[PDB]
Design a binder for these strands. Structure first.
Ligand code: MG
Lengths: 390, 34, 49, 1319, 54, 147
DNA sequence: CATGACGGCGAATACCC
RNA sequence: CGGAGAGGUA
DNA sequence: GGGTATTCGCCGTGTACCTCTCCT
């Protein structure tokens, strides 16, 4: 059908080579010549030559270049035949059926959001306004601010304050999918709750970067809006980062802190031989934090701290045991973000990358998924803060 | 991430041979035939 | 974009997919080698029927 | 000694190695190549002269008539570069060639002429190279990238196994002409030689010899040594030379003077052979059966019987030897044959050769060359002659012949462009003896085997293609036509030549849209060497070896600067001192070492000759007498590096920056950076966007001035003089008297480029760096260009940087930027965008540009004039109408501002075809252009008039003083007023005559310029008019933008921190940017740290000088401090003596140094750590480069010292403004109904195969389905989805995607019945 | 369908056309191409309901 | 010999870098884990490793020619001292080799991934328990002398 | 005309009985 | 708006 | 006549995105 082989206008007046209508034209030309020689009863040599030429015209239309010289267009580039339409990377199957361009999608450069929770991403408000546009139109109609479609379109174009309030209402719990190419594993696409931010760059949670193989030296990411209730619930239950903290390849956690978070935890859990405040005996982590913030005790000071830790019993209740621990001020301070049920020994050491990963493993094994996500976010906040303070 | 003589035991433990036979020897130490 | 056309060919023409794509379906179906089919179809020889 | 201009700001050089050779003109390759192409060459060796002499004379088939080339010339271009860029036309010169048609007398004795028609003929436009090595093609600036290709000649290669059995090395040779068929010879696994012409099917090698009129015995004589068997009575005794028998075992008891030396069963060794020095035995008896494994070489016949007893080259047997002996044939001819060094490859090839004479060889060659064609003896006899033996169809170039003779160890360098018999024979012999383990194969990637073709050579090649295409038509029209009185213009149709040249200059792979982000990008583009293009490689197919840094790249090709990704190792950067030789091979300079003394004599060595010498490193300490201070110098000898004594050393490197490219040479502390990050930094230096204010690098290498000057972006004084006038758009220099030609005023006018878009929509703006009355010398920078500061390349800004983590905002290479950087517009950049509005001729009616637009309010058209065109200076925003246009459907087709492109209208251009009534805005634009052009012929008239009157004043008061006649007689009465002549005004008759010629030059071209302004330019067919609107937008720095240093330390800004939140020092000074230390250790780009330290030191010096300027200290105090600053260093080469500077010069230099003293640290002769700490001490800064920082949020001291200094940071052309994009719904494709692609088309993101795999792995079937249908080509599904979302019903009703239907229709069109089944 | 969409589309389609092959939409790629719910994850039950109704 | 020298330089650098002296509670010297920033980053595992540290402050070590043969003379300098022209040019061989290796291996990895995806695309968990008794025998993987 | 890619694999070819 | 060529980003 | 080593033609060779010119 001709609408599947259109003629693309170039500057209106002239058309580019379709590369498919040309082969059809050659086939028709040779067929007409063979017909006008068939009724003519011409000598058999030229009739046979025309039959042969019609044959190469036909098999060039079907599969150009499969046998013999590849029939050439105006430029030396071979003509694209019918077989080329359906095969190869640019063929129909791989370019339009196994993958395709989609609506309700965008992309932008990614920057680090260190304040974000694991389930949140930072979405520019202009991108959100464009992406969620039909939802905005629906909400505008719902509360009567826009009588017609055009009224809602004009209000969104003018970017009125009530439009921004409606946009805030729509995206409150509507997850979005963030993707970074190459998508090497399912975790290359993950769901996040968007938070409206100023600027034009998408903010990414640090702990998911390893899953994306993402960094912030120029990386760009695509965002997609799950439209239907089924898609939204699939994003929340199947693809949300807080539900996908384990690698499907080996079962190990993917959200282990790296770089400056690890540096901060290591620095605050290191011990110094003659640090300020050494030998002090503290009522608990709160006193350690008070002494550190007031400058009366060094972060690496070896001290004695009364620590109350919790251990699960046979029936699963948290039995509390309180004891005096020989530790550091920084380890006691870090103990405050450790959820109940983990032993104090998990922090009573210089915490490197492997130690932090083991701590997250212990938290996941003992307490489950939600406390693990909360613990990971708290660890990342503490690591950032104390790496900065160091 | 992918990039395109004589045996010695190094730890304490008992020795076990499988698919092995015991035969007379010149020095008394078993040869292997399988 | 749904309605197709047809071209009534003045003479019969062989489909290249069923000729060149190895194994030659015409050649295997007839046991005449692909070379002879190529020469006859492309007017270099004759076949007795 | 320092000139007045360079006294303004002297960069402190820490370089210690003296500079023996200046950095050459960085654009010399392009200019020299194009000059060779276009300049007149009387010898006819290069360019257009050579191409014409190689296609002319055009002779008829009969030969009655011939067309003779006389000479050529290039006419004046119709438009200059600027007009060509404005009008969108190619900047080219007309080629006007003097031809002469000669018709001879019909049945003349020989060559008698009957007419000679000599005429000049036009053969098309030749695009001219600009002053900066660029071309203007269709109004766009393009660079012709030089190509690195395999040299023509003979190349001997092999396979190291990898093809058959195990470890069977197959050798081959390739004769590669510059023009013609490729001739290949190869060994098959059974040791037969095969020959291939143009990569066809392989034929036996002896076929080529048979076609060269060589018989079997002649071939055997060529490729074998004759052994003779001299039978006297019986026993088959054998005459030989001893040497032959060495290596193989003893077949018989060899006898010496009748006494046997070695018997059977013992292999002959070396001592055996040496014993025969005094044992000269010639006739040796051998067994009869020994002859069984032998070959008869000659063709033998009996005395008179006439029966062919044995022909040449056959296996001798007992029967054959016995019957040949019984006829008294006393001497037997055999071929010497061994198993390791004298293999019978030719004999076996003959044994498998089907051909047996010249006719058979020629017909076989015809069958191979032209498969499916039955050939006449004449046809083959002409085809073979045309393959390699006709100048017209085959051409080994001069470099090809040179390489061919050099590979075969021929003394002669010059030779013929076609192959001879001896050429092929010697190629085969060298291939055989390489197989025999006597020679070695060649290195394909060796730079002595890969040569350079630049713009001139490829332009000449394409011109030759056009010339031969025209020659065919000329010959057919000449022979077949009954020509009489016809002029040579009739035969010459210039369309083929013009088409070929335009194709080369507009569509060739090496004709590339110029990278014009900054001057360094231009320099790099003009200096790239490409292995791609025609006759080269393809990036999909190139292997590891050709992408590797070869040892011959040293000093010729930069090992650092190469693109990341697919193009790695295929696109290279010319080294700083590298240049091509006459044959196009890259050569690099070296200092000759004579008698252990490093002289200053410079020899340029190519890769071939460089490997024959011992070359000392540039990092080799010398003394005042030139001797090497040490006795064991590190040197390169044969692609290897070791130690040698000074007497062994033959050459030394001229500079420590010899191996690197310009971009790599601009990286300070390059030697402390890992090569990967150095590559990244060199690549990203070219992506830096020129900022609002050009800021010099505090830490530089010394190459910045050369880059800025050689780029051509700056205004450089052609002649010395004094700045007579200066403003933001123009500089007028009053030339010095000693630099004046006799008949001139001595006025140089430099018109500055102001706010013009680059090829990447960046701002090109020139601003003067000289003041009124300033003295200027030749070569001095008069006006800075984009990213240039006082003639120094200034790609970025000096940023006060602290290395510490800051609350995650620098995590994973993220960058924290203070709001003070935003406030000071440090990285604010100007971007100029060109929008076009085209009124065409529709079928219904002609499109109209007017202010009358329907369905739009009056307020929305307040920015348009009465002609419907936006005013100059209007502040437009996304959606605003620039040019109001209506189509007679009238539809609203007005050119609007693209969304979020809010900017300022700075220029409006109107182009109207002949016969179209130009509008009122067009009329007033025309009026402004007319007034400006009259001004360009009046102000440039009166300034030159003032200069001429100054010269007339000087001459008139010299020997002809007339004080009263100065004022009682004006300057208009010295020309015609009648009086007796004398010395007073006879000289004036030569100086005011040129004045009167400016009454004949400026005024005479006024009408022509008026015609050009009033000209109705030729537009595209159907185009009524074109309105070009130029929008200037200031992009301020924001999160999401990409910043980088020169060390490969790249990142994206994550946050714009308030000034009170930034870390600050004890003096309350906050840092500008916080970089993460953790990106330093694994990257191993330590230079960024050292530069930072050095940057701090540099700023410290300025911080003192500024203080001395704020306290108004004595000039002596500044002299003392600045002299101490320049004297600092460990025996640096630079010497700055402030005592020779005047007080005013010292004050000016101190003013230019108050923001920080520029430091020069050459890439491999840079500042040491001790020197940096010394400079830090001089500025009263800590030697560790680390200071105490406080948290702005809390005032708490950071627990450890933080590295704080100054790093030179670049804003890359990767702004988040250009990259952010979002789409809910929009336009869809035609064939598939899927959303369009690209931000420019407001397209949707592609959810590709791996994305679908991720969705499948999650089990998110509904999300995947909506990706496939309601968000893509399900037309009904997407409409229902949109309506449901508006209704608040988040439910889809997916249908069949249209792409599946398209696939079904396509398969059906292939004659295959594909259909869906029932439900 | 899956083989043709993978590689050697000409050969695979020729084999299918000569043999008169019939493709039941049972795999993930097949259902992706025709834009249906994949027989996995949340769509799995749907396909089960499609299978049990025949 | 050069490999042993590189090992000795690395050992000396790590020994001097990993430990620092400090005054105890009493006026007595004591050894403790160093607070050097680069050492802290490496030991914590945040960034860097032994190889990178010895490239920064030890010596770069033995390099390889493009064909893969090891160059006889190693780079005795480190990045803090700075390389000379010869050492830098030598190191560019390995740098270019690694970058081109990544560039040309990403395509092979993608092709292998696509082939694996196709061969396994249709395999879905369709049952809770098929009732099979067969299984594979899992032992610890031991090559001899290590686990 | 382009002549710098190469490994794997199956049908066809030739060689050796 | 389809194709080709060139360059670039991750 | 039939089994097997060699040859020849076909198949395949990462994703996403951005910029420019030029094209019956
Ligand atoms: Mg990255």
């Amino acid at each position: 059908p001709p609408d599947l082989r259109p003629l693309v206008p170039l500057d209106g007046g002239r058309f580019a080579t379709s590369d498919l209508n040309d082969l059809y034209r050659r086939v028709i030309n040779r067929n007409n010549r063979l017909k006008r020689l068939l009724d003519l009863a011409a000598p058999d040599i030229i009739v046979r030559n025309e039959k042969r030429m019609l044959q190469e015209a036909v098999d060039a239309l079907l599969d150009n270049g499969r046998r013999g010289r590849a029939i050439t267009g105006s430029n030396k580039r071979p003509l694209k035949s019918l077989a080329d339409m359906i095969k190869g990377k640019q063929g129909r199957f791989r370019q339009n059926l196994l993958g395709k361009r989609v609506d309700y999608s965008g992309r932008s450069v990614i920057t680090v959001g260190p304040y974000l929770r694991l389930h949140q991403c930072g979405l520019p408000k202009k991108m959100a306004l464009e992406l969620f546009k039909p939802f905005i139109y629906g909400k505008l109609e719902l509360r009567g601010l826009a009588t017609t479609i055009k009224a809602a379109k004009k209000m969104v174009e003018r970017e009125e304050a009530v439009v921004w309030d409606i946009l805030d209402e729509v995206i409150r719990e509507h997850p979005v999918l963030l993707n970074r190419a190459p998508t090497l594993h399912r975790l290359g696409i993950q769901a996040f709750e968007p938070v409206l931010i100023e600027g034009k760059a998408i903010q990414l949670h640090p702990l998911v970067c390893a899953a994306y193989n993402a960094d912030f030296d120029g990386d760009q990411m695509a965002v997609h809006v799950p439209l239907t209730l089924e898609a939204q619930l699939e994003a929340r239950a199947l693809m949300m980062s807080t539900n996908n903290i384990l690698s499907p390849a080996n079962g190990e956690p993917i959200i282990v802190p790296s770089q400056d978070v690890v540096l901060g935890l290591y620095y605050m859990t290191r011990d110094c031989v003659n640090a300020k405040g050494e030998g002090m005996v503290l009522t608990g982590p709160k006193e350690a934090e008070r002494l550190y913030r007031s400058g009366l005790a060094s972060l690496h000071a070896r001290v004695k701290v009364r620590i109350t830790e919790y251990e699960k019993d046979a029936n699963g209740e948290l039995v509390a045991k309180t004891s005096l621990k020989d530790t550091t001020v920084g380890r006691a301070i870090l103990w405050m973000i450790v959820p109940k049920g983990l032993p104090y020994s998990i922090v009573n050491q210089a915490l490197g990358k492997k130690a932090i990963s083991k701590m997250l493993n212990t938290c996941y094994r003992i307490l489950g998924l939600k406390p693990t996500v909360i613990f990971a976010d708290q660890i990342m906040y503490t690591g950032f803060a104390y790496a900065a303070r160091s | 991430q992918l990039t395109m003589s004589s045996i010695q035991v190094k730890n304490k433990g008992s020795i076990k041979l499988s698919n092995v036979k015991s035969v007379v020897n010149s020095s008394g130490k078993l040869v292997i035939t399988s | 974009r749904e309605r197709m056309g047809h071209i009534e060919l003045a003479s019969p023409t062989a489909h290249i997919w069923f000729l060149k794509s190895l194994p030659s379906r015409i050649g295997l179906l007839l046991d005449m080698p692909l070379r002879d089919i190529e020469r006859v179809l492309y007017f270099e020889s004759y076949v007795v029927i | 000694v320092y000139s007045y201009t360079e006294k303004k700001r002297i960069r402190k050089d820490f370089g210690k190695r003296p500079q023996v050779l200046d950095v050459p003109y960085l654009l010399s390759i392009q200019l020299d190549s194009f000059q060779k192409f276009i300049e007149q060459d009387p010898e006819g060796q290069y360019g257009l002269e050579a191409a014409f002499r190689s296609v002319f004379p055009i002779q008829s088939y009969s030969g009655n008539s011939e067309l003779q080339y006389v000479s050529y010339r290039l006419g004046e271009p119709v438009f200059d570069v600027q007009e060509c860029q404005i009008r969108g036309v190619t900047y080219s010169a007309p080629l006007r060639v003097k031809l002469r048609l000669v018709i001879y007398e019909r049945e003349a004795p020989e060559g008698t002429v009957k007419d000679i028609k000599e005429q000049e003929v036009y053969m098309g436009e030749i695009p001219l190279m600009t002053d900066n090595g660029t071309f203007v093609i269709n109004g766009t600036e393009r660079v012709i990238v030089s190509q690195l290709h395999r040299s023509p000649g003979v190349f001997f290669d092999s396979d190291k196994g990898k093809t058959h059995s195990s470890g069977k090395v197959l050798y081959n040779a390739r004769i590669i002409p510059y023009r013609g068929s490729w001739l290949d010879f190869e060994f098959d696994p059974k040791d037969n030689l095969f020959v291939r012409i143009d990569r066809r099917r392989k034929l036996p090698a002896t076929i080529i010899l048979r076609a060269l009129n060589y018989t079997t015995e002649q071939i055997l004589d060529l490729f074998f040594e004759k052994v003779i068997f001299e039978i006297r009575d019986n026993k088959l005794q054998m005459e030989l030379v001893p040497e032959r028998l060495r290596g193989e075992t003893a077949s018989f008891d060899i006898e010496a003077n009748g006494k046997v030396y070695v018997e059977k069963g013992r292999r002959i060794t070396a001592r055996h052979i040496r014993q025969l020095e005094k044992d000269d035995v010639k006739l040796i008896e051998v067994p009869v059966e020994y002859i069984a494994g032998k070959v008869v070489a000659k063709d033998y016949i009996d005395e008179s019987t006439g029966e062919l007893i044995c022909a040449a080259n056959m296996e001798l047997s007992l029967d054959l030897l016995a019957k040949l002996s019984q006829s008294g044939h006393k001497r037997i001819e055999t071929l010497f044959t061994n198993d390791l060094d004298h293999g019978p490859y030719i004999s076996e090839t003959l044994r498998v050769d089907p051909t047996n004479d010249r006719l058979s060889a020629l017909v076989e060659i015809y069958r191979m060359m032209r498969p499916g064609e039955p050939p006449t003896r004449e046809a083959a006899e002409s085809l073979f002659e045309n393959l390699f033996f006709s100048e017209d169809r085959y051409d080994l170039s001069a470099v090809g012949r040179m390489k061919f003779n050099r590979s075969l160890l021929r003394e002669e360098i010059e030779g013929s462009g076609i192959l001879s018999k001896d050429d092929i024979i010697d190629v085969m012999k060298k291939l055989i003896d390489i197989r025999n383990g006597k020679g070695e194969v060649d290195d394909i990637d060796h730079l002595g085997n890969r040569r350079i073709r630049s713009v001139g050579e490829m332009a000449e090649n394409q011109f030759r293609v056009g010339l031969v295409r025209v020659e065919r038509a000329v010959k057919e029209r000449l022979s077949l036509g009954d020509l009489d009185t016809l002029m040579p213009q009739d035969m010459i149709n210039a369309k083929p030549i013009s088409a070929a040249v335009k194709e080369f200059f507009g569509s060739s792979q090496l004709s590339q849209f110029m990278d014009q982000n900054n001057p360094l990008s231009e320099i790099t583009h003009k200096r790239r060497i490409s292995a791609l293009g025609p006759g080269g490689l393809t990036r999909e197919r190139a292997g590891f070896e050709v992408r590797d840094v070869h040892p011959t790249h040293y000093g010729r090709v930069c090992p650092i600067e190469t693109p990341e990704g697919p193009n790695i190792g295929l696109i290279n950067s010319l080294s700083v001192y590298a240049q091509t030789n006459e044959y196009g091979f890259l050569e690099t300079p070296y200092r000759k070492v004579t008698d252990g003394v490093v002289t200053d004599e410079i020899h340029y060595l190519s890769a071939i000759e460089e490997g024959n010498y011992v070359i000392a490193q540039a990092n080799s300490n010398l003394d005042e007498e030139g001797h090497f201070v040490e006795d064991l110098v590190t040197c390169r000898s044969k692609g290897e590096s070791s130690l040698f004594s000074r007497d062994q050393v033959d050459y030394m490197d001229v500079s420590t920056q010899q191996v690197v490219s310009v971009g790599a040479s601009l990286i300070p502390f390059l030697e402390h950076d890992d090569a990967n990050r150095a590559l990244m930094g060199a690549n990203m230096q070219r992506q830096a966007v020129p900022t609002l204010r050009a800021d010099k690098p505090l830490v530089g290498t010394g190459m910045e001035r050369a880059v800025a000057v050689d780029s051509g972006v700056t205004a450089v004084a052609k002649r010395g003089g004094v700045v007579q006038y200066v403003d933001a758009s123009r500089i007028v220099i009053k030339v010095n008297e000693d630099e004046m030609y006799p008949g001139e005023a001595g006025i140089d006018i430099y018109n500055l480029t102001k706010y013009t878009r680059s090829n990447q929509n960046t701002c090109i703006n020139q601003m003067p760096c000289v003041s009124l009355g300033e003295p200027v010398e030749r070569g001095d920078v008069l006006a800075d260009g984009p990213s240039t500061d006082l003639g120094e390349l200034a790609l970025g800004q000096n940023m006060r940087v602290a290395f510490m983590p800051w609350n995650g905002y620098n995590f994973e290479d993220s960058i924290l930027v203070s709001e003070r950087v935003v406030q000071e517009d440090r990285f604010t950049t100007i971007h100029i965008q060109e929008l076009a509005c085209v009124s065409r001729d529709t079928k219904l009616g002609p499109e109209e540009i007017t202010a009358d637009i329907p369905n739009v309010g009056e307020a929305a058209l307040s920015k348009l004039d009465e002609s419907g065109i936006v005013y100059i200076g209007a502040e437009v925003t996304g959606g605003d109408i620039l040019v109001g246009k209506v189509t007679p459907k009238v539809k609203d087709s007005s050119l609007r501002v693209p969304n979020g492109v809010s900017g300022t209208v700075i220029d409006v251009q109107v182009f109207t075809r002949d016969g179209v009534e130009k509008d009122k805005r067009a009329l007033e634009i025309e009026e402004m252009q007319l007034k400006q052009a009259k001004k360009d012929l009046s102000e440039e008239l009166q300034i030159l008039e003032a200069g001429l009157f100054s010269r007339i004043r000087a001459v008139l008061v010299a020997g002809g003083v007339e004080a009263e006649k100065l004022d009682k007689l004006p300057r208009d009465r010295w020309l015609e007023l009648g009086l007796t002549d004398e010395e007073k005004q006879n000289q004036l008759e030569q100086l005011a005559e040129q004045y009167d010629e400016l009454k004949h030059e400026f005024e005479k071209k006024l009408e022509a310029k008026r015609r050009k302004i009033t000209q109705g330019d030729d537009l595209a067919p159907g185009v009524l008019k074109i309105v070009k609107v130029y929008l200037a937008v200031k992009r301020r720095i924001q999160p999401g933008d990409k910043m980088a240093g020169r060390h490969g330390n790249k990142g994206v800004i994550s946050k714009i921190n308030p000034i009170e939140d930034m870390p600050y020092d004890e003096n309350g000074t906050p840092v500008d940017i916080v970089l993460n230390p953790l990106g330093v250790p694994s990257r191993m780009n330590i230079g960024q740290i050292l530069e930072t330290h050095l940057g701090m030191a540099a700023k410290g010096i300025g911080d003192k000088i500024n203080a001395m300027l704020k306290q108004q200290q004595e000039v002596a105090k500044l002299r003392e401090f600045i002299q101490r600053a320049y004297d600092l260093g460990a025996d640096v080469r630079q010497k700055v003596d402030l005592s020779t500077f005047s007080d005013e010069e010292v004050m000016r230099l101190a003013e230019n140094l108050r923001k920080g003293m520029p430091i020069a640290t050459p890439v491999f002769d840079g500042a040491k750590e001790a020197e940096i700490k010394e400079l830090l001490k001089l500025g009263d800064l800590p030697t560790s480069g680390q200071i105490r920082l406080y948290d702005g949020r809390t005032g708490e001291q950071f627990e450890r010292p933080v590295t704080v200094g100054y790093m030179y940071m670049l804003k890359l052309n990767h702004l988040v403004d250009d990259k952010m994009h979002a789409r809910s719904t929009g336009s869809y494709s035609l064939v598939t109904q899927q959303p369009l692609g690209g931000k420019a088309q407001f397209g949707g993101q592609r959810f590709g195969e791996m994305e679908v795999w991720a969705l499948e792995a999650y089990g998110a079937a509904y999300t995947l389905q909506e990706m496939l249908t309601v968000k893509s080509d399900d037309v009904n599904g997407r409409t229902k989805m949109y309506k449901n979302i508006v209704d608040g019903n988040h439910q889809m009703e997916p249908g069949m995607p249209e792409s599946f239907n398209v696939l079904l229709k396509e398969i059906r069109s292939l004659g295959i019945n594909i259909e869906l089944e029932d439900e | 369908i899956s083989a043709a969409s993978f590689q050697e589309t000409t050969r695979v389609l020729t084999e299918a056309a000569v043999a008169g092959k019939r493709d039941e939409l049972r795999g993930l790629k097949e259902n992706v191409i025709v834009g249906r719910l994949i027989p996995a994850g949340t769509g799995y039950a749907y396909h089960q309901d499609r299978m049990r109704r025949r | 010999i050069w490999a042993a020298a590189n090992d000795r330089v690395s050992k000396a650098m790590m020994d001097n870098l990993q430990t620092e002296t400090v005054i105890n509670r009493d006026g007595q010297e004591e050894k403790q884990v160093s607070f050097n920033s680069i050492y802290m980053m490496a030991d914590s595992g945040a960034r860097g490793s032994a190889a990178q540290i010895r490239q920064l402050a030890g010596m770069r070590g033995l390099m390889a020619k493009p064909d893969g043969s090891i160059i006889e003379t190693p780079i005795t300098a480190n990045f803090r001292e700075g390389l000379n022209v010869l050492q830098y040019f030598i190191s560019t061989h390995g740098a270019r080799k690694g970058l081109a290796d990544t560039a040309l291996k990403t395509a092979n990895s993608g092709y292998l991934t696509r082939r694996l995806v196709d061969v396994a695309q249709d395999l879905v968990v369709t049952e809770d328990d098929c009732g099979t008794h067969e299984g594979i025998m899992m032992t610890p993987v031991i090559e001899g002398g290590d686990v």
